[model samples]
Target: LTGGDELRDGPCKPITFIFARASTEPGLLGISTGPAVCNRLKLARSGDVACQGVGPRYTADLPSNALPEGTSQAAIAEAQGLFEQAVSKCPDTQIVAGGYSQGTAVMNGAIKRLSADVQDKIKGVVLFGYTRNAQERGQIANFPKDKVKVYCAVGDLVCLGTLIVAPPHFSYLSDTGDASDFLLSQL
Candidate 1:
């Protein structure tokens, strides 16, 4: 669960995979998935890397219910917890967070929660399948500049245009028929 190769083989990698869960409080049903993409990148390149997976926040009794309002706090708490655990396990490593879908919201929340010093440890961030509005961007306005690299795939309909602004460090790619190409280009 802590390496990229592992993630590539894990549940999240499969298009059929629906949800990947995590929790803030320890001993909870779901928590960290260790270092996924970052570990693999580090291992292959012989560089230090730390990664954390942030799960969606609100869970309802209805199986297909939409996330409740104000769920961002829950996601932020989980990310804060996971980042703390990762740093504790590897004190001297560069951290780069990545997430897909609702997971991207959690990573965004985590960036808001981190102290400036801890934020300094973050190298970059890749958010896949992100869906954010101008209001959400206002919430993350203070995120460290030039450090986080955001890649969003346009033409997905869910993620496009001024609903969300793409910073200079951020790159937006339009779909090119091939799903794999769309995903790989973002990486």
Candidate 2:
């Protein structure tokens, strides 16, 4: 958790959930995924393993932060390297990769880089309020459609695109219990 987790616990579930957080903008805190969904998994199941997904805080600010997209693209490589390393050390672990907002885009990028065999080990991919919501840009072309569970609020502009960052964009934190449960069920 980049912003540091607000939820407290050592995860112990059979499944491990790797989460990337929202775009707080461009700064240390802005790039953080926080513990939004990480804690949700641990708290909801009380035994699931949850860890912070790593990446830079990409920004949408043109004059100031034009590289949020590319920054996260680089983060995709970083996160994939980390994800691959985790699997190497813990080959028995089941992976469910995900993120929120820009973080979701990060996860999407990582999955696209993996081979079929590598992707096979990943049990599920969860995305909340995806920036590409109904759009095809950044879609995980090879990740099985059945294995990914996407949660975009009824009117979240991030994914819904009538969209500007709004209340629905932030709604995922409260809605995470359901998304977490769904991810766990798939495991």
Runs with alpha carbons beyond 4 Å of true place in candidate 1: 1-43, 46-52, 55-72, 136-140, 160-187
lDDT of each: 0.40, 0.61
Residues 1-187, candidate 2: write the lDDT tens digits: 3332211132323555666656554432233233555666667667546464554433423222124442245567766765675566566767776777766667777776888877887887778778765553435556788777787877787775333777777776666667667677777
How big is the positional error of residue 145 in model 1, measured in Å on the Cα after superposition? 3.3
- RMSD (CA, Å), candidate 2 to true, equals 4.7
Instruction: Name the 10 consecutive residues with the lowest summed lDDT in model 1.
Output: 13-22
In model 2, the runs with Cα more than 4 Å from the true position are: 1-13, 25-34, 44-50, 56-71, 137-139, 160-163
